[PDB]
């Protein structure tokens, strides 16, 4: 067996579809997700055409080995998918209806710049390589592209599963390659982030700010430095567990600013005490009183600037 | 190696049964569980019916490749189950009795809203795809559904193993499919949750409340802030290792409240000292005295409200 | 390729023997252990008997596929064992000397109530399902049950590897199952626990007791609260990495008591200071002096009670 | 299924080419990287020569089992690559053009001395063992060497993918081996390191330097020791998760210096207080005043020396 | 498919050789190491012996399935090695020369008593089980035992790869077994340990010793207790990453001593303050002055004793 012959000079159309059965193991660190789905394939092989009358059958079932089947591969997979041919059906005209169940660990880049208010498009790229006898081209039947209602990823809302209908046909190592883009659109469930991370982090910072209503240098040193320890401790607790991102994220910028604020509050506490000790209590008291407003105001403003820059 | 022919036009009934041998590795982070069980299958194939007189034997044993066997798959699995056919028996009327031992990692969503007082229903979905010549329908043989008495999951109580007898018949990829729901009901047993996590966490909070029987601002700052560090430290220690849940859990709400209480106690400590320093000792002393009752009372009340809202 | 026929009505005896080559990966969290061993099987199939004179051979070697071999499975395994048939020998009377090398991850419950002074019995359950034509029964020859001298599990003393000679014969899914219990007895190597965990944990607690020889409330608050932070920090450092146990362990009770002691010492420190401040230095001094004896005595007593209750 | 015969005594040339489809999972700890690529192979096997006229076809397609294929292995792999033969094309002269898609976990040493400003050369070593009947030699078909434009490694810039055209031919276990070196050049994306690691670590160090504008020994002990705790805490937070490198890294030297600086600042704080207490306030005040300049200057100077020594 | 016949009554000698291609993944927690190597096997089979003059070939090449090959297994492996037969050559006298490339995860116990100044001997145990017709014995072909020059293990110096030429012949499961010991000798690269672990741990302890030049009980409590927190924190940072070792290690003893020293320094600080407060300043001042010398001296002496006892 070799590819079906062209009637004219036309390429062979392999109609595809992917139906998600299970989506699992989305890994933010590895930028990978595990999928379990159906892969449907449809094409015409006139060599396989038959007279249903003089055959006594309206359909013919074949073993994968018995007939020509296109070699469809996935571009962005760790290793080749584990596939199980579910069914192969041939109709009197030579139409082949192929179906397999497969599992695969798909590599898809994730953008964490807007985390935890991010949305992602997961990609699954189907590909076919042409042979010398004839060019093979992929097509999508969107009726055949879907997902089980029960499919889920914890912490994400799965908006849709679709395919970009126009394939990407290009030459590679002297042969045409036809590629399809299947997209899984997901948006993060950011609720518990406010009470679980942000609010507690904010409270610690706010505690450090009470040093602006105290003249006790010993109590102030304990306030700013102990809260810095509590902040670091809290970040270890709520730690992403992923190796640090190469780029600056939204949450990343806020956290950097919180460290800057702890340093600035230490400078203030240091300045106020030095001024007091160096017989200048009027300047010390005026700085501390300004800080009471300057600190929350500069914080709230910089946060609005960051929110604006990222979104 | 073709499906058994219908006597009329009826679909083929495949009577199923699952008998749990072992259940293990329930992973809370992954929402998966590993199972080891028997899968029994029974259907009628009249091409296999025989006369026990001119054969001699009351039962016939076949190799899987000698006869037609329905392809049963699991819907919610990572990869296909590891199976080993244990036995294939045919009775004189053509009734096939198939048995295999399998192991599988089943994906089943878990609800942590009532943790650690939560109960879960683990699902195992059997499925069969119909074939060209005839439709295949699943059924439950309750005589063949059960679990070994020694079956266990650490930290859980296994209430029951049962199946929803009526299958879910629907259409997939242009063919009819019959699905079954096997349910494993488990409820969390965490006897040690109180002593192990709760109490030490309450003691730390209670220590912060001793600041209401002290006028020393330096000692008060050390009490509230050092206990906040101890609280965060304790939460790192008793951390589940599972990424934070997208939703608000019961234990999650209690912990959020504990952070709020540390912030409120800091505000009090700050207010009391400012009033004392700003020549108002009457208002400072009256706030601190109120707090001694207000703090435990508001805590005990909010906890009753939370327990009521979640349960 | 059918079971050997009976001479009367007696069941077929499959003589077993397990010889441990390697024991590894004992996971306390998973309650699982990986084993690599020999499995010996012995039975008589008269259909295989031969005249050594006619044959010109005193022994006959077969491929597993060529003859009837009982289907032996393990009850408490994650998946079916990976096996390599090492040898199949048939003597003139039809005796089969089967030998295979296998690896398997065995699930065996572990009791942590007496940790780290615990001993465990690891189980390996062999099983055979009886067929249509005849009943199959397992037997042990203890001469054939052993372990390599080099077998080891880090942190454990392996006392013995044996089998309970009497099989457990029972009905399951309308057939007989003959089950064998192979036991691996192990006892933990608790030495480094004293200098690594116990001793530093006691020193931290002892430091909090120095607050009973101090009147300085600021120094006392620093002693009790900072040591509580050090205790929690130390617990994070020496943490088992296994999720907390559903039941109350011995070490678990001691740790709970240590948290209770930190809370009680805070109460004392708080009471002392309040009485001292509120014009009652006679009570404050008498409480602190009592605590100096009360604390070590109540600790040493409760510990004896706990050691008695657990052992 | 024996190697093609030589026309004279010439070795067989196997022309190779690797085209990267996906690159992923670079593991810094393991010094390994996962790759998914095409492996093209070409050689002349005259036994496969045909007349395009008698055959009809200008090219012949074969199954891997039908013809002799050289055994190409990778030297630096964990296990053998997972390969899937995409195409085998034979031209009339008997020139075979083989193409396979493979995935492999390649072991390649990484130098972390200049981290996070490091560049690495990842190696993939192709190898072929010569046979009894003839010597096999590898060659590079540069037309068939490349990488997909979309190839990415999070946190790295992929500079180039190339092959050292001259093979390394040597004797091993009495036969010739022909080895090829494919190189993937990558350079790290160090941006977020400044705001995420460097800057917050410098702020904690700077806070410790405020002890040089304070005479309060109690406040100074709190400053230096509490910041040391915050530093250690921060290091736990930003920890690589890879076991410590056997060699001294650039970042490793900076961190060692920061610990030295915390110790020196403690010595100063200790010296200043002892001089004050031992009736020498002139010496104490002159040391503290010097330290205010000495500390940032010696730090900035040692950092320039380190940056010079490493780069 | 039968073993070669003996010329007299001699056992069959299988000459072995292992050539290391790659060594990777040495895991200290798991006490395992992954190896990729060649395994050469040589034995004489006269049934395969041929006259070269009437045969006309240098060496005959066979497929594994075609001829008898001894079953060589590894004793200390997780699962059976993944092997790929590279070549099978037969010379006129019947000498079979077998070669395979294999990968295996070898289990080899490690002694951490002298860590990080330890050396280890990694073992690879080859084994062969004798057959019905003849006894099989292993031997070492020293020409075929080696390692690639590029073989590496990060953090270790690979000293040698040798084999103990005399096999260990013994009886197992009623048959003779010939065992060979291949040894990989490695010594640890302990450099970065001094600046990364030892030095910062000694600085934290040294800071605690400044309490001997202070009379301030509040500052002393902060020094000793806060440094104990910093020590524990540092230990979490530099943590072994392996579950605790059952035996007392060298580094383990030093760390235990450091905890003892923190407790002793607390006792001193407590004693000095009590003596001062209980009208005995002569006794207090003399203890603190003694401690200034007693502490570093007792430390340096106990360390010399430990280094002597372990080495
Ligand atoms: Cl694929
Ligand atoms: Cl399945
Ligand atoms: Cl098994
Ligand atoms: Cl390879
Ligand atoms: Cl092996």
Tab-separated table of N, CA and C in Angstrom, chain E residues 168-262:
chain	number	residue	atom	x	y	z
E	168	UNK	N	31.647	-15.199	42.241
E	168	UNK	CA	31.138	-15.789	43.466
E	168	UNK	C	30.168	-16.842	43.015
E	169	UNK	N	30.581	-18.108	43.095
E	169	UNK	CA	29.728	-19.227	42.660
E	169	UNK	C	29.051	-19.836	43.858
E	170	UNK	N	27.747	-19.956	43.794
E	170	UNK	CA	26.997	-20.485	44.901
E	170	UNK	C	25.716	-21.081	44.366
E	171	UNK	N	24.960	-21.763	45.223
E	171	UNK	CA	23.725	-22.402	44.815
E	171	UNK	C	22.552	-21.569	45.207
E	172	UNK	N	21.616	-21.409	44.286
E	172	UNK	CA	20.393	-20.666	44.534
E	172	UNK	C	19.204	-21.326	43.863
E	173	UNK	N	18.150	-21.648	44.654
E	173	UNK	CA	16.934	-22.277	44.130
E	173	UNK	C	17.322	-23.535	43.363
E	174	UNK	N	18.253	-24.314	43.933
E	174	UNK	CA	18.726	-25.596	43.410
E	174	UNK	C	19.520	-25.592	42.153
E	175	UNK	N	20.170	-24.495	41.830
E	175	UNK	CA	21.037	-24.435	40.657
E	175	UNK	C	22.213	-23.557	41.001
E	176	UNK	N	23.333	-23.785	40.328
E	176	UNK	CA	24.573	-23.026	40.495
E	176	UNK	C	24.407	-21.656	39.844
E	177	UNK	N	24.814	-20.587	40.550
E	177	UNK	CA	24.782	-19.214	40.049
E	177	UNK	C	26.182	-18.579	40.145
E	178	UNK	N	26.672	-18.014	39.036
E	178	UNK	CA	27.983	-17.372	39.019
E	178	UNK	C	27.781	-15.870	39.003
E	179	UNK	N	28.261	-15.159	40.049
E	179	UNK	CA	28.121	-13.717	40.227
E	179	UNK	C	29.445	-12.942	40.044
E	180	UNK	N	29.420	-11.800	39.330
E	180	UNK	CA	30.589	-10.912	39.156
E	180	UNK	C	30.351	-9.523	39.746
E	181	UNK	N	31.394	-8.920	40.313
E	181	UNK	CA	31.294	-7.620	40.945
E	181	UNK	C	32.059	-6.571	40.151
E	182	UNK	N	31.321	-5.666	39.519
E	182	UNK	CA	31.898	-4.535	38.816
E	182	UNK	C	31.795	-3.343	39.760
E	183	UNK	N	32.919	-2.665	39.976
E	183	UNK	CA	32.982	-1.562	40.909
E	183	UNK	C	33.355	-0.255	40.263
E	184	UNK	N	32.565	0.795	40.603
E	184	UNK	CA	32.783	2.156	40.177
E	184	UNK	C	33.135	2.907	41.437
E	185	UNK	N	34.404	3.365	41.537
E	185	UNK	CA	34.890	4.094	42.707
E	185	UNK	C	34.841	5.569	42.476
E	186	UNK	N	34.105	6.254	43.344
E	186	UNK	CA	33.867	7.694	43.298
E	186	UNK	C	34.212	8.345	44.644
E	187	UNK	N	34.728	9.582	44.604
E	187	UNK	CA	35.034	10.400	45.781
E	187	UNK	C	34.405	11.784	45.583
E	188	UNK	N	33.730	12.297	46.616
E	188	UNK	CA	33.011	13.572	46.592
E	188	UNK	C	33.879	14.825	46.449
E	189	UNK	N	33.371	15.835	45.704
E	189	UNK	CA	33.966	17.153	45.478
E	189	UNK	C	33.375	18.143	46.505
E	190	UNK	N	33.928	18.086	47.714
E	190	UNK	CA	33.563	18.861	48.902
E	190	UNK	C	33.939	20.366	48.939
E	191	UNK	N	34.362	21.020	47.816
E	191	UNK	CA	34.838	22.404	47.980
E	191	UNK	C	33.879	23.456	48.447
E	192	UNK	N	32.842	23.731	47.668
E	192	UNK	CA	31.857	24.749	48.001
E	192	UNK	C	31.171	24.547	49.354
E	193	UNK	N	31.398	23.412	50.024
E	193	UNK	CA	30.838	23.133	51.324
E	193	UNK	C	31.295	24.137	52.391
E	194	UNK	N	32.615	24.399	52.443
E	194	UNK	CA	33.211	25.333	53.386
E	194	UNK	C	32.522	26.718	53.276
E	195	UNK	N	32.631	27.456	52.144
E	195	UNK	CA	31.923	28.747	52.055
E	195	UNK	C	30.389	28.699	52.019
E	196	UNK	N	29.789	27.604	51.547
E	196	UNK	CA	28.328	27.533	51.445
E	196	UNK	C	27.599	27.063	52.683
E	197	UNK	N	28.144	26.059	53.395
E	197	UNK	CA	27.497	25.476	54.575
E	197	UNK	C	28.205	25.770	55.883
E	198	UNK	N	29.461	25.311	56.028
E	198	UNK	CA	30.267	25.438	57.250
E	198	UNK	C	30.449	26.884	57.735
E	199	UNK	N	31.089	27.735	56.913
E	199	UNK	CA	31.349	29.117	57.295
E	199	UNK	C	30.134	29.912	57.752
E	200	UNK	N	28.999	29.985	57.024
E	200	UNK	CA	27.866	30.772	57.541
E	200	UNK	C	27.257	30.191	58.813
E	201	UNK	N	27.374	28.869	58.996
E	201	UNK	CA	26.876	28.208	60.196
E	201	UNK	C	27.754	28.550	61.401
E	202	UNK	N	29.075	28.726	61.191
E	202	UNK	CA	29.963	29.099	62.285
E	202	UNK	C	29.759	30.571	62.650
E	203	UNK	N	29.544	31.471	61.653
E	203	UNK	CA	29.265	32.889	61.912
E	203	UNK	C	28.031	33.076	62.820
E	204	UNK	N	26.917	32.356	62.557
E	204	UNK	CA	25.685	32.441	63.369
E	204	UNK	C	25.963	32.064	64.838
E	205	UNK	N	26.792	31.024	65.054
E	205	UNK	CA	27.213	30.552	66.385
E	205	UNK	C	28.106	31.598	67.057
E	206	UNK	N	29.082	32.155	66.298
E	206	UNK	CA	29.986	33.186	66.790
E	206	UNK	C	29.220	34.413	67.259
E	207	UNK	N	28.172	34.838	66.519
E	207	UNK	CA	27.323	35.974	66.926
E	207	UNK	C	26.740	35.705	68.321
E	208	UNK	N	26.302	34.440	68.598
E	208	UNK	CA	25.746	34.087	69.914
E	208	UNK	C	26.741	34.283	71.056
E	209	UNK	N	28.043	34.193	70.738
E	209	UNK	CA	29.138	34.337	71.695
E	209	UNK	C	29.414	35.786	72.103
E	210	UNK	N	28.830	36.766	71.383
E	210	UNK	CA	29.015	38.169	71.747
E	210	UNK	C	28.256	38.514	73.042
E	211	UNK	N	27.348	37.620	73.483
E	211	UNK	CA	26.579	37.771	74.724
E	211	UNK	C	27.509	37.733	75.955
E	212	UNK	N	28.755	37.261	75.744
E	212	UNK	CA	29.796	37.168	76.770
E	212	UNK	C	30.547	38.502	76.985
E	213	UNK	N	30.218	39.540	76.193
E	213	UNK	CA	30.759	40.887	76.298
E	213	UNK	C	29.602	41.874	76.509
E	214	UNK	N	28.509	41.378	77.129
E	214	UNK	CA	27.305	42.149	77.424
E	214	UNK	C	26.708	41.722	78.751
E	215	UNK	N	26.178	42.700	79.493
E	215	UNK	CA	25.535	42.486	80.792
E	215	UNK	C	24.014	42.639	80.640
E	216	UNK	N	23.560	43.211	79.489
E	216	UNK	CA	22.147	43.424	79.168
E	216	UNK	C	21.454	42.088	78.921
E	217	UNK	N	20.601	41.645	79.866
E	217	UNK	CA	19.883	40.373	79.761
E	217	UNK	C	18.946	40.369	78.574
E	218	UNK	N	18.256	41.493	78.332
E	218	UNK	CA	17.337	41.636	77.203
E	218	UNK	C	18.091	41.507	75.876
E	219	UNK	N	19.273	42.163	75.758
E	219	UNK	CA	20.096	42.051	74.549
E	219	UNK	C	20.698	40.643	74.399
E	220	UNK	N	21.042	39.993	75.528
E	220	UNK	CA	21.602	38.640	75.523
E	220	UNK	C	20.587	37.592	75.086
E	221	UNK	N	19.331	37.671	75.607
E	221	UNK	CA	18.215	36.787	75.248
E	221	UNK	C	17.975	36.911	73.734
E	222	UNK	N	17.971	38.156	73.211
E	222	UNK	CA	17.828	38.424	71.781
E	222	UNK	C	19.005	37.819	70.992
E	223	UNK	N	20.244	37.961	71.482
E	223	UNK	CA	21.385	37.362	70.795
E	223	UNK	C	21.304	35.841	70.695
E	224	UNK	N	21.235	35.118	71.823
E	224	UNK	CA	21.205	33.654	71.813
E	224	UNK	C	19.990	33.020	71.141
E	225	UNK	N	18.786	33.497	71.468
E	225	UNK	CA	17.559	32.949	70.900
E	225	UNK	C	17.366	33.313	69.432
E	226	UNK	N	17.605	34.581	69.050
E	226	UNK	CA	17.495	34.963	67.637
E	226	UNK	C	18.507	34.238	66.766
E	227	UNK	N	19.757	34.003	67.252
E	227	UNK	CA	20.756	33.239	66.474
E	227	UNK	C	20.357	31.764	66.341
E	228	UNK	N	19.720	31.184	67.383
E	228	UNK	CA	19.217	29.816	67.327
E	228	UNK	C	18.192	29.732	66.188
E	229	UNK	N	17.252	30.723	66.095
E	229	UNK	CA	16.268	30.828	64.996
E	229	UNK	C	17.012	30.924	63.661
E	230	UNK	N	18.019	31.814	63.555
E	230	UNK	CA	18.824	31.955	62.336
E	230	UNK	C	19.528	30.648	61.937
E	231	UNK	N	20.055	29.891	62.932
E	231	UNK	CA	20.731	28.606	62.734
E	231	UNK	C	19.754	27.607	62.117
E	232	UNK	N	18.569	27.408	62.778
E	232	UNK	CA	17.530	26.501	62.308
E	232	UNK	C	17.153	26.913	60.882
E	233	UNK	N	16.869	28.230	60.672
E	233	UNK	CA	16.507	28.782	59.367
E	233	UNK	C	17.574	28.413	58.326
E	234	UNK	N	18.876	28.603	58.656
E	234	UNK	CA	19.978	28.272	57.762
E	234	UNK	C	20.001	26.774	57.447
E	235	UNK	N	19.749	25.922	58.462
E	235	UNK	CA	19.683	24.472	58.270
E	235	UNK	C	18.562	24.082	57.310
E	236	UNK	N	17.393	24.766	57.366
E	236	UNK	CA	16.280	24.531	56.425
E	236	UNK	C	16.788	24.874	55.013
E	237	UNK	N	17.517	26.002	54.880
E	237	UNK	CA	18.092	26.445	53.612
E	237	UNK	C	19.099	25.424	53.015
E	238	UNK	N	20.057	24.944	53.811
E	238	UNK	CA	21.091	24.024	53.338
E	238	UNK	C	20.770	22.525	53.501
E	239	UNK	N	19.537	22.208	53.933
E	239	UNK	CA	18.963	20.888	54.221
E	239	UNK	C	19.353	19.831	53.248
E	240	UNK	N	19.793	18.667	53.790
E	240	UNK	CA	20.226	17.444	53.088
E	240	UNK	C	19.379	17.047	51.900
E	241	UNK	N	18.015	17.302	51.948
E	241	UNK	CA	16.972	16.958	50.948
E	241	UNK	C	16.614	15.443	50.904
E	242	UNK	N	17.312	14.641	51.729
E	242	UNK	CA	17.118	13.195	51.891
E	242	UNK	C	16.472	12.938	53.243
E	243	UNK	N	15.622	11.884	53.401
E	243	UNK	CA	15.111	11.582	54.751
E	243	UNK	C	16.298	11.271	55.656
E	244	UNK	N	16.159	11.604	56.938
E	244	UNK	CA	17.233	11.428	57.895
E	244	UNK	C	17.829	10.039	57.847
E	245	UNK	N	19.148	10.023	57.945
E	245	UNK	CA	20.001	8.846	57.918
E	245	UNK	C	19.842	8.119	59.273
E	246	UNK	N	19.711	6.765	59.322
E	246	UNK	CA	19.550	6.069	60.625
E	246	UNK	C	20.750	6.137	61.580
E	247	UNK	N	21.962	6.352	61.026
E	247	UNK	CA	23.232	6.443	61.738
E	247	UNK	C	23.716	7.890	61.913
E	248	UNK	N	24.669	8.074	62.838
E	248	UNK	CA	25.237	9.377	63.133
E	248	UNK	C	26.377	9.672	62.164
E	249	UNK	N	26.188	10.720	61.366
E	249	UNK	CA	27.144	11.203	60.384
E	249	UNK	C	28.107	12.196	61.051
E	250	UNK	N	29.210	12.544	60.372
E	250	UNK	CA	30.192	13.508	60.871
E	250	UNK	C	29.526	14.891	60.999
E	251	UNK	N	28.956	15.408	59.878
E	251	UNK	CA	28.234	16.688	59.817
E	251	UNK	C	27.071	16.671	60.807
E	252	UNK	N	26.470	15.510	60.991
E	252	UNK	CA	25.374	15.306	61.926
E	252	UNK	C	25.758	15.549	63.363
E	253	UNK	N	26.980	15.096	63.747
E	253	UNK	CA	27.545	15.269	65.092
E	253	UNK	C	27.870	16.741	65.358
E	254	UNK	N	28.545	17.441	64.392
E	254	UNK	CA	28.866	18.877	64.465
E	254	UNK	C	27.575	19.689	64.727
E	255	UNK	N	26.521	19.446	63.936
E	255	UNK	CA	25.235	20.124	64.072
E	255	UNK	C	24.609	19.862	65.449
E	256	UNK	N	24.655	18.596	65.942
E	256	UNK	CA	24.121	18.265	67.269
E	256	UNK	C	24.820	19.067	68.351
E	257	UNK	N	26.150	19.215	68.201
E	257	UNK	CA	27.007	19.951	69.116
E	257	UNK	C	26.638	21.428	69.116
E	258	UNK	N	26.367	21.999	67.917
E	258	UNK	CA	25.942	23.393	67.746
E	258	UNK	C	24.635	23.646	68.498
E	259	UNK	N	23.685	22.700	68.473
E	259	UNK	CA	22.444	22.825	69.246
E	259	UNK	C	22.711	22.813	70.760
E	260	UNK	N	23.618	21.920	71.203
E	260	UNK	CA	24.061	21.799	72.597
E	260	UNK	C	24.687	23.128	73.083
E	261	UNK	N	25.563	23.734	72.241
E	261	UNK	CA	26.210	25.018	72.494
E	261	UNK	C	25.216	26.166	72.634
E	262	UNK	N	24.135	26.178	71.837
E	262	UNK	CA	23.101	27.204	71.963
E	262	UNK	C	22.399	27.065	73.293
